[PDB]
Structure formats: C-alpha cells, structure tokens
C-alpha cells in the first residue's frame, strides 16, 4: 504493498512535526482528507510542497 507518503496522491495539508532520528530530515505530514499521517523526506517535501514547508518554519519562528 500500500502507497505511502507522496505516492498516496493526496494534497499535503500541514506538517505536524520534524525529525532527523533516521539520518536525514523528515516531516510528519498530514494530508488533506486523511487522519493517517506519514513521514516524508524534507528533500522531497521541499520540492513538492515548498509553501507547506515554509508555513511550518514560519509558525515556529
């Protein structure tokens, strides 16, 4: 298998939080119309939804 992350084909709603416990920066992403969030690489989020990433940083900050 079942799609995860950006491969679910859902619009990102908001970043719930960030973590780098795996070696690289990841974001816990909430998608529109789903209560199932999943971890996506920051490197992918930066490109695919920059404004969602920027909103997360700006609120903090």
């Amino acid at each position: 298998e079942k799609p995860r992350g950006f491969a679910r084909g859902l619009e990102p709603e908001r970043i719930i939080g960030a973590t780098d416990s795996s070696g690289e920066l990841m974001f816990l992403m909430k998608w529109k119309n789903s209560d199932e969030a999943d971890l996506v690489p920051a490197k992918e989020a930066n490109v695919k939804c920059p404004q969602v990433v920027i909103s997360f940083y700006e609120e903090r900050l």
Binding site: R14, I15, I16, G17, A18, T19, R60
Partner: peptide, 7 residues
C-alpha cells in the same frame, strides 16, 4: 522517535 512540533 522524537518529533519537533509546529508552534
């Protein structure tokens, strides 16, 4: 398994 929150 730690997450920094929005915020």
């Amino acid at each position: 398994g730690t997450v920094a929150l929005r915020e």
